[PDB]
């Protein structure tokens, strides 16, 4: 067991109306198990995956990672976790603007203080894996739309996390990087015991994860019946 949801509900209300998002979410992602999430815009996928991590306080639920809830973890403990076990990717991915692609990819390692040489070599390892070594000297501003997304993916997977949460990892890219990056994740899981949980809209390859769930305005329907 890696993920554990017990009626993970949420709702945003600033004082105007009660805008419910989710109703009693419950599932699990097995160690070294892939899954895919499908649905329509506004369903609440991104909010759900934010809740899965320690990056949004749930209203009436909890998430257990390795037999220990997220709000359980202290701030230092959550910082501990985010370096070696979290491979979260951001929709509208956000990157440090004053740091080039190489440094952004190397930041998890710098925070872990691995080594100068190891950090550089491994940042470049993963950058070549994603395939933007030609734009390793460009800051996010100078980078185009897709190469920054690939930089975010590499930063997520540079440190070899146990679990990889994603928000449309390949939705701003042609079939090239979509298919190639699915190949990359596919080898990752069967070369390394890393599980994946990716939200995507491209239904041709959504079944690569297999067991593709369907977020449906609260609860993740097991069937893909729309």
């Amino acid at each position: 067991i890696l993920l554990q949801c017990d009626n993970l509900c949420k709702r945003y209300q600033e004082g105007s109306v009660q805008t419910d998002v989710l109703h009693n979410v419950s599932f699990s992602v097995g160690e070294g198990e892939m899954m895919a999430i499908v649905g329509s815009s506004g369903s609440g996928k991104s909010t759900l995956l934010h809740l899965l991590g320690g990056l949004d306080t749930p209203t009436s639920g909890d998430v257990i990672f390795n037999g220990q809830p997220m709000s359980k973890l202290s701030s230092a403990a959550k910082a501990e976790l985010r370096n070696q076990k979290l491979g979260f990717i951001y929709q509208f991915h956000h990157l440090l603007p004053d740091f080039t692609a190489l440094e952004n990819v190397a930041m998890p390692l710098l925070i872990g203080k691995k080594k100068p040489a190891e950090i550089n070599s491994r940042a470049l390892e993963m950058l070549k894996a994603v395939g933007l070594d030609h734009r390793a000297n460009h800051r996010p501003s100078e980078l185009s739309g897709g190469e920054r997304q690939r930089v975010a993916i590499a930063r997520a997977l540079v440190n070899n996390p146990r679990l990889v949460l994603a928000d449309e990892p390949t939705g701003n890219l042609d079939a090239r990087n979509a298919d190639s990056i699915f190949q990359l994740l596919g080898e990752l899981n069967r070369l390394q015991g890393t599980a994946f949980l990716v939200v995507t809209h491209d239904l041709q390859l959504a079944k690569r994860m297999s067991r593709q769930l369907e977020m449906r305005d609260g609860r993740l329907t097991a069937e893909l019946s729309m």
Binding site: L55, H94, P97, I111, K113, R155
Partner: protein, 399 residues
């Protein structure tokens, strides 16, 4: 690159993106403000210290500043030995017989004071004497030296002797308290660049004692040089162990004392205004910067950085900015302070103040820089903690 993450992140943020002109000189506004504040404070403090020194030396230095004695006179051993005479400041011991006198002259009658100094010891006025033997000055039938503003102008001039009177004397009670008077001889004319000339004169030692009351060999008290005559109030308030009355220069130049007190008070008020405005700018700019970078803080927090480390990330930038600002401000303030004598083309025609500067590096300059350091550190400390508590998803949504 650098092993410490906080230092690297802080330095990179300090460098900035530098879009066109280093962010149109908007990125370094914090350092600019620190520099301006430090420069202004340093210049003001140096000029005020110079003013105080000028008042202390060029005016009050020559004239007597304090005297102690007993009721109407001292005793045979000067009423006391040198012991228990030093209380505060740089005090030099010298017998004196100060007393107001009337210097009647044929050309015009005038009044003034005198000093009963001895030829053996020096005084502020000894180097100013010209064409006279100050060192070899015997009584010579009550010989005196005075002029260049009284004898030369509106007086009997050098030579021909002059009249000297002491109203405080009871010689023959029957008439209207006839004072003690005698003819004195002039052997020189001191030239002075202060108020001393035209109001003061020099007499041999013990001649004032013989002329006045109380036994010969005694004096009216002892001169006491003060390190801070500007603040002589504290000395006057304190009572010396012997119980002798504390005379002071304020009994004569009270107007100057009150004026300088008021000027210093209101200048301190202006300095307070400067400090308040500058500190407000420091807090405002640094806090708004730290709050501006909340999105980057959120991105950083989700990948292993603790709330206690981002605080260091921002404190590094704050300290670097404060360092640059303080050093630049100190340098510029020192230069401006030691450049104020000139640059008065037309204002100097009627305002010949010259803004006398005194760059006191030892303490005043450094304390301002350290205070700026502390203020910047605290200002970068608090907002960083405030922004480190918000959940990253909430911050990255509004971003």
């Amino acid at each position: 690159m650098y092993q410490p993450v906080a230092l690297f992140i802080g330095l990179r943020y300090m460098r900035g993106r530098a879009a066109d002109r280093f962010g149109r000189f908007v990125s370094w506004l914090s350092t600019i403000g620190i520099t301006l504040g430090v420069m202004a404070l340093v210049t003001v403090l140096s000029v005020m210290n110079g003013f105080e020194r000028e008042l202390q030396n060029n005016i009050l230095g020559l004239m007597p500043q304090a005297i102690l004695s007993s009721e109407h006179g001292s005793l045979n051993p000067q009423q006391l030995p040198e012991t228990a005479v030093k209380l505060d400041g740089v005090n030099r011991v010298a017998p004196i017989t100060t007393g107001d006198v009337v210097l009647q002259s044929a050309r015009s009658v005038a009044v003034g004071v005198m000093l009963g100094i001895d030829p053996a010891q020096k005084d502020p006025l000894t180097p100013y004497l010209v064409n006279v033997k100050q060192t070899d000055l015997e009584p010579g039938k009550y010989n005196v030296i005075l002029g260049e503003q009284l004898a030369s102008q509106l007086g009997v001039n050098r030579g021909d002797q002059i009249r000297v009177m002491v109203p405080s004397a009871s010689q023959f009670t029957p008439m209207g308290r006839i004072p003690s008077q005698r003819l004195f001889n002039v052997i020189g004319t001191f030239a002075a660049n202060s108020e001393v000339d035209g109001y003061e004169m020099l007499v041999n030692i013990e001649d004032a004692s013989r002329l006045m009351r109380y036994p010969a060999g005694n004096i009216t008290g002892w001169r006491l040089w003060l390190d801070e005559p500007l603040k002589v109030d504290s000395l006057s308030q304190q009572k010396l162990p012997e119980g002798s009355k504390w005379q002071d220069w304020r009994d004569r130049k009270g107007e100057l004392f009150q004026a300088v007190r008021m000027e210093k008070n209101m200048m301190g008020l202006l300095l307070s205004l400067i400090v308040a405005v500058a500190a407000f700018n420091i807090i405002t700019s640094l806090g708004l910067m730290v709050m501006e970078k909340q999105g980057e803080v959120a991105i950083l927090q989700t990948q292993g950085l603790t709330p206690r480390q981002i605080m260091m990330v921002f404190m590094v930038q704050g300290a670097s900015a404060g360092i640059i600002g303080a050093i630049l401000g100190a340098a510029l303030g020192a230069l401006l302070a030691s450049q104020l004598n000139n640059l008065m083309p037309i204002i100097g025609v009627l305002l010949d103040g010259a803004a006398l500067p005194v760059a006191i590096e030892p303490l005043q300059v450094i304390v301002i820089a350290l205070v700026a350091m502390a203020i910047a550190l605290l200002s970068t400390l608090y907002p960083s903690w405030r922004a480190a508590a918000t959940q990253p998803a909430e911050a990255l949504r509004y971003e």
